[PDB]
Amino acid sequence: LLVTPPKALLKPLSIPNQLLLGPGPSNLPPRIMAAGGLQMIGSMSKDMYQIMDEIKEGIQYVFQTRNPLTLVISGSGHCALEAALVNVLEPGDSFLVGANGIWGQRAVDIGERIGARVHPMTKDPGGHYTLQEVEEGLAQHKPVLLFLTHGESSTGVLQPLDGFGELCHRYKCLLLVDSVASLGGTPLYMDRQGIDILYSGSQKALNAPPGTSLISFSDKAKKKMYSRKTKPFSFYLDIKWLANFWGCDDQPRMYHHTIPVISLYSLRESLALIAEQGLENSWRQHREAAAYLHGRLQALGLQLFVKDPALRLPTVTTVAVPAGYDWRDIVSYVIDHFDIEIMGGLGKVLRIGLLGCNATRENVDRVTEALRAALQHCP
Amino acid sequence: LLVTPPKALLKPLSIPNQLLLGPGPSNLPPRIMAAGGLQMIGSMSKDMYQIMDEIKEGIQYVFQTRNPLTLVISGSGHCALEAALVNVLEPGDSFLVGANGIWGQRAVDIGERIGARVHPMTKDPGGHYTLQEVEEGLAQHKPVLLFLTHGESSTGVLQPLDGFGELCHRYKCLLLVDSVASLGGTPLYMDRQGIDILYSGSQKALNAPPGTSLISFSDKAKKKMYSRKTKPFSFYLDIKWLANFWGCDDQPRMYHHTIPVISLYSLRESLALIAEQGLENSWRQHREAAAYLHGRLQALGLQLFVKDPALRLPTVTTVAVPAGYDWRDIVSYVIDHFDIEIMGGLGKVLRIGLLGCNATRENVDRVTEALRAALQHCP
Ligand SMILES: *Cc1c(COP(=O)(O)O)cnc(C)c1O
Ligand SMILES: *Cc1c(COP(=O)(O)O)cnc(C)c1O
Numbered sequence: 001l002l003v004t005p006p007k008a009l010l011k012p013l014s015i016p017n018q019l020l021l022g023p024g025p026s027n028l029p030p031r032i033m034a035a036g037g038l039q040m041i042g043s044m045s046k047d048m049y050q051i052m053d054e055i056k057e058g059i060q061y062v063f064q065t066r067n068p069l070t071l072v073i074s075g076s077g078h079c080a081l082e083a084a085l086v087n088v089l090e091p092g093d094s095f096l097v098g099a100n101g102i103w104g105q106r107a108v109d110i111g112e113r114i115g116a117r118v119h120p121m122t123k124d125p126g127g128h129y130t131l132q133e134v135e136e137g138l139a140q141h142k143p144v145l146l147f148l149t150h151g152e153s154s155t156g157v158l159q160p161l162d163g164f165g166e167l168c169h170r171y172k173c174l175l176l177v178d179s180v181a182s183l184g185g186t187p188l189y190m191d192r193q194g195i196d197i198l199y200s201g202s203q204k205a206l207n208a209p210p211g212t213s214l215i216s217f218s219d220k221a222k223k224k225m226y227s228r229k230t231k232p233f234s235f236y237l238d239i240k241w242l243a244n245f246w247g248c249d250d251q252p253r254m255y256h257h258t259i260p261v262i263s264l265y266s267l268r269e270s271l272a273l274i275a276e277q278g279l280e281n282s283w284r285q286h287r288e289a290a291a292y293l294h295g296r297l298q299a300l301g302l303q304l305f306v307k308d309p310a311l312r313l314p315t316v317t318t319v320a321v322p323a324g325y326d327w328r329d330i331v332s333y334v335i336d337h338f339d340i341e342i343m344g345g346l347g348k349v350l351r352i353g354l355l356g357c358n359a360t361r362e363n364v365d366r367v368t369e370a371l372r373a374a375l376q377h378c379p
Numbered sequence: 380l381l382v383t384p385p386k387a388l389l390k391p392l393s394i395p396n397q398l399l400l401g402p403g404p405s406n407l408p409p410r411i412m413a414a415g416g417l418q419m420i421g422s423m424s425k426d427m428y429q430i431m432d433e434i435k436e437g438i439q440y441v442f443q444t445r446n447p448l449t450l451v452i453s454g455s456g457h458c459a460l461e462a463a464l465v466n467v468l469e470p471g472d473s474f475l476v477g478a479n480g481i482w483g484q485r486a487v488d489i490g491e492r493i494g495a496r497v498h499p500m501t502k503d504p505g506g507h508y509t510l511q512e513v514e515e516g517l518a519q520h521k522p523v524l525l526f527l528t529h530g531e532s533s534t535g536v537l538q539p540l541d542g543f544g545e546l547c548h549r550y551k552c553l554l555l556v557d558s559v560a561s562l563g564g565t566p567l568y569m570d571r572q573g574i575d576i577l578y579s580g581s582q583k584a585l586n587a588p589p590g591t592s593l594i595s596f597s598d599k600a601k602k603k604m605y606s607r608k609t610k611p612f613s614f615y616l617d618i619k620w621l622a623n624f625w626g627c628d629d630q631p632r633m634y635h636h637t638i639p640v641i642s643l644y645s646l647r648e649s650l651a652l653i654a655e656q657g658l659e660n661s662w663r664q665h666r667e668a669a670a671y672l673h674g675r676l677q678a679l680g681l682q683l684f685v686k687d688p689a690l691r692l693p694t695v696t697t698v699a700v701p702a703g704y705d706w707r708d709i710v711s712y713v714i715d716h717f718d719i720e721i722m723g724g725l726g727k728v729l730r731i732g733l734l735g736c737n738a739t740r741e742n743v744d745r746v747t748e749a750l751r752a753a754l755q756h757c758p
Contacts, residue, residue: 002443002570005654006436013430013647015420025637028419036641037416040407041394042720043582043589051392057385064381074590076453078615078636086612110614191381203422203637210422211453211590211639233465233612235489236457255725257457258404258582260590262415263642268392275384341421346634 018335019358021367022343023153023181023316025203025210026355028266031273032208035265043258051268052246052259058271059214062183062206062279063198065190070216071246072267073199073237074260077180080199080213082110083237084176087225088145088197091115096143096173098129101154102347103178107147114233119143125155125347126306126318131167138171144224145174145197151182153204153353154345156306156318158186165194174221180204183214184274184356185286185315196221202263205286205315207356208270212263274356282356289359290314293352296368300375305349315359319350325378333374340370397714398737400746401722402532402560402695404582404589405734407645410652411587414644422637430647431625431638437650438593441562441585441658442577444569449595450625451646452578452616453639456559459578459592461489462616463555466604467524467576470494475522475552477508480533481726482557486526493612498522504534504726505685505697510546517550523603524553524576530561532583532732533724535685535697537565544573553600559583562593563653563735564665564694575600581642584665584694586735587649591642653735661735668738669693672731675747679754684728694738698729704757712753719749 020027028036041047052072059070073080085107089095095116098104100123111118119141121129129148138146146168150159161177168175174196179188184205190198196218202208217225217239225239232238241256243249274282290312294304297319305318321327327344334340343351352367354360399406407415420426431451438449452459464486468474474495477483479502490497498520500508508527517525525547529538540556547554553575558567563584569577575597581587596604596618604618611617620635622628653661669691673683676698684697700706706723713719722730731746733739 001658002568003440003445005657006433006440008433009437009440009647009651009654013414013644013651015417015430015644016426017418018420018424020419020421022421025419025422025640033416033418035392037412038394039396039412040399040404040588041397042399042401042714043404045397045720047395051394054385054387058388061382061385061388066382074455074458075615076636076639079453082613082615106614113610113612113614189381201637209419209639209641210637211642231492233492234461235485235492236454236461257455258580258589260455260588260639260642261404262588262645263590263639265392265394266641268388272388272392275388278384279380335421341424 018339018341020341021353022341023351023353026207026358029207029357031269032266035269038265043261051264055268063190063216065216067216067218069222069248073213073215076210077201080215084197085110086114086232086234086237087239089114089116090228094141094143096137096141096146098148100127101152103149128157128159134167143173145176147176150177150179151313151315153181153316156313156316157311158313161193181316184282187283202267205355206270208266212267286314286359289354292361293317293364296364300371315355317352321349329378330374333378334370338370340367397718397720399720400732401720402730402732405586405737408586408736410648411645414648417644422640430643434647442569442595444595446595446597448601448627452592452594455589456580459594463576464489465493465611465613465616466618468493468495469607473520473522475516475520475525477527479506480531482528507536507538513546522552524555526555529556529558530692530694532560532695535692535695536690537692540572560695563661566662581646584734585649587645591646665693665738668733671740672696672743675743679750694734696731700728708757709753712757713749717749719746
């Protein structure tokens with residue numbers, strides 16, 4: 001045989017103890033770890049369906065919707081995003097994109113690839129979107145879909161949502177919102193803010209492991225996706241298939257692909273936890289924690305990138321890179337000395353993440369103490 | 380708030396004990412269960428890279444290749460398939476498809492959607508592909524890629540591979556092979572059989588949980604994918620991105636998407652297990668087990684769908700539905716009474732699956748004893 005058994009693979013697997021306080025993913029609580037270590041069931045069993053059904057109710061609770069087209073995408077953030085775009089947008093269609101960070105910049109790339117006419121409202125890092133600025137683009141381009149990034153995790157910006165859906169609906173437009181870095185860590189009401197496509201990820205404020213995502217579609221969205229001329233470019237992400245399997249339509253569930261059963265156990269639990277906490281409690285915790293963290297960082301003499309506190313994303317705090325330092329040096333120091341992960345921002349600045357169980361005063365202390373030492377030790 | 384916490388989610392998660400002896404997925408051995416219950420690490424950490432690197436060596440060992448473009452697709456079977464097609468095929472291109480079951484029939488649907496000229500060599504259930512029949516299609520259509528299903532899990536057929544790659548290479552064609560239901564359970568030598576794209580799944584004979592897949596690309600494939608006019612329809616599955624992240628190219632690893640870390644721990648172990656066993660041992664086990672199972676089924680008076688033993692897939696046995704029975708009745712009886720999953724075949728027949736740790740004489744006994752009772756109790 002050409003290749004021999006890899007020597008490295010013949011040693012036992014060993015992983016460190018890291019406190020993950022970057023934009024994502026987050027650490028796992030015991031219940032989610034426990035779920036991950038369970039045994040398989042049939043991927044098309046009555047029991048597996050029950051679990052999926054339970055998950056659906058959970059996606060409904062956290063999204064605050066009753067949309068019966070709500071389900072899990074067998075993929076990460078980008079897959080839920082891609083899934084949205086490839087099932088809603090037909091080649092030609094006009095797509096209006098809020099390019100504040102990256103997330104917009106990705107939604108763009110996807111749009112371009114599937115042959116959409118892409119309308120990029122570029123705003124420098126830190127910037128958000130004013131309803132008027134939307135209507136001016138909506139007037140200028142007459143799109144079929146707008147994409148807005150709720151929790152902009154590259155810039156630490158919390159986009160205001162209220163009233164945007166009803167603007168979009170007037171111009172016939174569909175609202176797609178990226179709530180991956182916002183869900184569970186700030187107010188969000190899918191049906192009451194009139195959102196047509198909402199998606200989130202498992203590995204941010206729900207404290208499940210990466211590789212699943214939550215998606216929900218309004219009837220307005222459902223119509224546009226169920227009255228395409230053409231078939232979507234992706235079969236894996238074809239909604240008409242997914243919807244059927246996940247039990248959304250009248251037809252009995254027909255095998256499409258194999259769902260990541262063990263991740264679904266985990267996700268189910270992560271949903272049960274925030275269902276036991278309660279959304280408003282979760283939003284309180286994140287709101288307060290964030291508040292504490294800004295105060296502490298302020299004390300160290302660091303400047304918060306997002307100036308207006310009402311525009312700061314609780315879950316992800318952007319901190320301006322202190323003049324005269326190498327960001328790599330600080331971030332590497334932190335992990336190296338204290339065993340704490342703090343990302344940078346992509347497209348610069350320092351990024352810190354309070355997500356679910358990880359969003360406690362203790363963790364803020366810890367990252368503050370760490371950034372302290374580093375500030376006085378980095379060249 | 381519109382939606383209240385789902386009452387069902389406020390009870391604790393409870394899953395049955397099922398022996399999964401269908402085409403997939405398979406049951407998990409303790410080491411893989413253990414890996415699934417571990418804590419997160421940074422998705423772009425030195426430690427996470429080591430793990431990915433280790434996995435790569437493992438994909439190289441089981442595929443029997445040295446292709447430095449080998450990596451894990453963050454998706455199931457279909458995603459690795461889709462990933463192959465969307466990165467190799469450009470709209471127009473000619474694609475020659477071995478539509479024996481299904482897997483071909485899906486590769487078709489994908490091909491059509493991404494705007495390939497699709498050439499379907501339909502063969503009734505049970506049928507395989509003769510080198511001549513290939514060359515006649517290769518002559519008739521002059522494709523850029525042929526798709527062959529190695530272990531045809533819908534029909535229980537083992538396709539012969541030997542020499543097909545060198546045929547394909549002569550006509551300038553690329554060989555893509557679906558080894559999801561064959562890898563680890565029959566001989567397969569990527570480089571020595573001249574295969575340009577080989578993919579497999581985690582949830583079949585490797586005994587990892589669903590939701591990851593293994594893919595490898597030859598230099599011939601790499602050239603075609605790295606000299607497209609256009610960008611692939613998918614960003615999630617863009618090889619130039621994936622390749623970079625997974626450390627395949629000269630550029631430092633740049634964030635694309637978030638890899639399903641916990642599934643990667645599992646997959647790493649599943650690879651370590653077959654690296655400790657050794658491929659030829661694994662092929663012996665499956666070969667023998669299969670042999671035993673056919674004998675026993677024969678004794679019950681059941682007829683094996685695939686007549687020629689040299690064409691029977693060890694890992695998945697097709698058994699002709701006995702005249703005068705409802706297949707649903709037998710299959711439901713089996714799970715209902717004995718707690719054993721035995722699928723049907725899609726596009727009919729009964730399907731039984733011996734995959735990795737699950738491929739033992741004991742499990743054959745068990746499914747035989749079960750099918751016995753059912754045969755004499757179903758109407
Ligand atoms: C993390 C994140 C993503 C990316 O999701 P993946 O897990 O990388 O697929 C996208 N958008 C936002 C807002 C995020 O926070
Ligand atoms: C199971 C299987 C598939 C489907 O893979 P998914 O896990 O459903 O994405 C495809 N091909 C073969 C040969 C299989 O055995």
